[PDB]
Amino acid sequence: YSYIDPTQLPYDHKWEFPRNRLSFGKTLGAGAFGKVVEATAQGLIKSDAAMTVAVKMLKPSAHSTEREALMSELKVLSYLGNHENIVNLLGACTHGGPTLVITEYCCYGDLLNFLRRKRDEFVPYLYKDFLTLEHLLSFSYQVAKGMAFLASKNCIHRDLAARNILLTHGNITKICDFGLARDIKNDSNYVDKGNARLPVKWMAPESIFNSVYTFESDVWSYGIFLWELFSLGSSPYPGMPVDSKFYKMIKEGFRMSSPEYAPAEMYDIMKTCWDADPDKRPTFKQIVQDIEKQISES
Numbered sequence: 001y002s003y004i005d006p007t008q009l010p011y012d013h014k015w016e017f018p019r020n021r022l023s024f025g026k027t028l029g030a031g032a033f034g035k036v037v038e039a040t041a042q043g044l045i046k047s048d049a050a051m052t053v054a055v056k057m058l059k060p061s062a063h064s065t066e067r068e069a070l071m072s073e074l075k076v077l078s079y080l081g082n083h084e085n086i087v088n089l090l091g092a093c094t095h096g097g098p099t100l101v102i103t104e105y106c107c108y109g110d111l112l113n114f115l116r117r118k119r120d121e122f123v124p125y126l127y128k129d130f131l132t133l134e135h136l137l138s139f140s141y142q143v144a145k146g147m148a149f150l151a152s153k154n155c156i157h158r159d160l161a162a163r164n165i166l167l168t169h170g171n172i173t174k175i176c177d178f179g180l181a182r183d184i185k186n187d188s189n190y191v192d193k194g195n196a197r198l199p200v201k202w203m204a205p206e207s208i209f210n211s212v213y214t215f216e217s218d219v220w221s222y223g224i225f226l227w228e229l230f231s232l233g234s235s236p237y238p239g240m241p242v243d244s245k246f247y248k249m250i251k252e253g254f255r256m257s258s259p260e261y262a263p264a265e266m267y268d269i270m271k272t273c274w275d276a277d278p279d280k281r282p283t284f285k286q287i288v289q290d291i292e293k294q295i296s297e298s
């Protein structure tokens with residue numbers, strides 16, 4: 001929810017695709033109630049050529065709440081329309097069986113696992129495809145541009161992190177949301193807080209203590225994502241478990257020091273994203289303008 005009720009958004013039937021034209025392959029990811037599988041779609045291209053796609057669907061374990069949530073995701077994707085910095089909708093199957101959501105396939109997978117795999121060969125300054133500082137600045141710019149677009153459409157992400165960014169051809173990043181297709185019960189980055197399992201280390205104080213999610217709380221998460229990026233995939237608040245001492249320290253103003261590979265101007269952005277006053281944080285549009293200047297000066 002937040003600013004817009006996703007259940008009231010319309011679904012354009014121009015997206016309707018016949019489900020008998022899909023051939024399912026390997027499961028890319030699974031949670032308790034949902035999954036994402038790799039598939040071949042036939043007749044999606046005007047010229048009889050087959051194409052590889054990603055398909056999100058529910059498991060027989062899912063209930064009415066999860067069935068409403070997958071339909072709401074489809075309505076939001078149809079409402080947003082395509083954007084270069086967001087995973088794009090290609091089609092959907094809404095009759096003749098369970099809901100299927102068809103999105104573009106991203107050959108390099110999630111950004112978190114890519115950074116961890118590339119960590120040991122990082123170059124701060126050719127066939128080998130080494131990760132450089134130039135690539136980290138470009139990723140930070142592309143993610144801020146996609147988030148500036150979501151905010152302009154009155155959308156709040158609520159789970160922005162490196163694990164929710166995909167990487168495709170030509171070092172292009174795409175904002176995504178695995179949601180129900182992530183096993184949050186066995187992921188240590190999600191913590192038990194009341195009757196929920198939440199990503200506390202990425203959450204703004206107003207979201208933790210008041211359950212308030214806004215344009216400003218997404219900006220706090222972006223600052224945490226920057227720390228993950230310039231630490232080459234390390235977990236935030238290293239050596240600190242999520243306990244009473246953690247919630248106390250955050251309220252009292254404790255903040256992480258800069259990661260090892262962050263330029264000083266990128267750490268300056270992180271600090272402003274983590275201001276206790278939501279009105280003192282920059283907008284995603286201001287972040288884009290700031291990074292643009294850094295890239296041009298480089």
Ligand SMILES: COc1cc2ncnc(Oc3ccc(NC(=O)Cn4cc(C(C)C)nn4)cc3)c2cc1OC
Pocket residue numbers: 028029036054055056073076077086087103104105106107108109110166175176177178
């Ligand atoms: C080679 O490995 C992979 C390739 C992949 N290629 C493509 N997709 C993959 O997974 C998916 C991840 C997420 C989604 N769904 C959404 O993001 C829908 N959405 C967007 C939003 C917001 C508006 C931003 N809200 N909801 C669909 C598929 C892959 C996973 C891989 O490995 C794990």
